[PDB]
Design a protein around this ligand. Structure first.
Ligand SMILES: [Cl-]
Ligand SMILES: [Cl-]
Ligand SMILES: [Mn+2]
Ligand SMILES: [Mn+2]
Ligand SMILES: [Mn+2]
Ligand SMILES: [Mn+2]
Lengths: 146, 146
């Protein structure tokens, strides 16, 4: 029982990268499943969806080791030990997306001659602003307010 | 109607990074929802799950622009225009994970004194090998075989 700290280790970075790849895999497989669905391949669609559940299990297990080891959220570098911390992590990521990421992407898309992509990024910025506000309302309630 | 190619643009990289962040957000929010569930916060859990659906919509829309613009899969740098290409992308990512990513992570985890994390990475390598084989079997069927 020689217990070591994950902070600042390569393993900590590897758990974060594992989480990213697992997250992408579930999204990709469910996206692919819709193409199988369209074209009439229910067994392929079903396999994609079942393997996607595996990737959920993998992502969540990475997060368990991250949280239990006192590492931060891969997306935000904020702690995710408690429910309030998790909501704070949500708010930080949403805030980054609507105040920095998506408006910057929309500006670049317009500069590069991709106005339809820019309008999408603008739509998303508005959506993440909404998400942030709604998470802020839950945080206020968790902290004992209205 | 002055149509430009997304390949090699900043916008192409921004769609990929958008996809990564959206993927992580859906995973994180569903993970957070389970903590809300445990502790008896059904309205918070429900909000997390509903916002997670938004993040699905966002991720899938990024993939639509990627695919429609002839860009490759953020996770594998493989085309994802057709169902067979999507399955090939799945196989490539699974193959990377079991033949390189997870065994390398397990080796590093053991070196750094994290055997329980290593055993997890070893479990995952075995799982991704299984996923690869099962996707390879579907690809063989899509190509007209048994
Ligand atoms: Cl089928
Ligand atoms: Cl509640
Ligand atoms: Mn996996
Ligand atoms: Mn959001
Ligand atoms: Mn989003
Ligand atoms: Mn897999």
């Amino acid at each position: 029982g020689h217990m070591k700290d994950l902070k600042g280790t390569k393993t900590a970075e590897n758990l974060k990268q594992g989480f990213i790849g697992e997250s992408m895999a579930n999204r990709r497989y469910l996206y692919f499943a819709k193409r199988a669905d369209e074209e009439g391949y229910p067994e392929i669609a079903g396999l994609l969806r079942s393997i996607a559940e595996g990737e959920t299990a993998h992502a969540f297990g990475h997060l368990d080791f991250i949280r239990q080891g006192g590492l931060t959220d891969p997306a935000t570098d904020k702690p995710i030990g408690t429910l309030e911390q998790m909501i704070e992590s949500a708010i930080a990521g949403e805030t980054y997306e609507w105040t920095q990421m998506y408006p910057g992407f929309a500006k670049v898309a317009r500069e590069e001659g991709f106005p339809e992509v820019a309008e999408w990024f603008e739509t998303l910025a508005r959506a993440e602003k909404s998400h942030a506000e709604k998470f802020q309302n839950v945080l206020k309630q968790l902290k004992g307010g209205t």
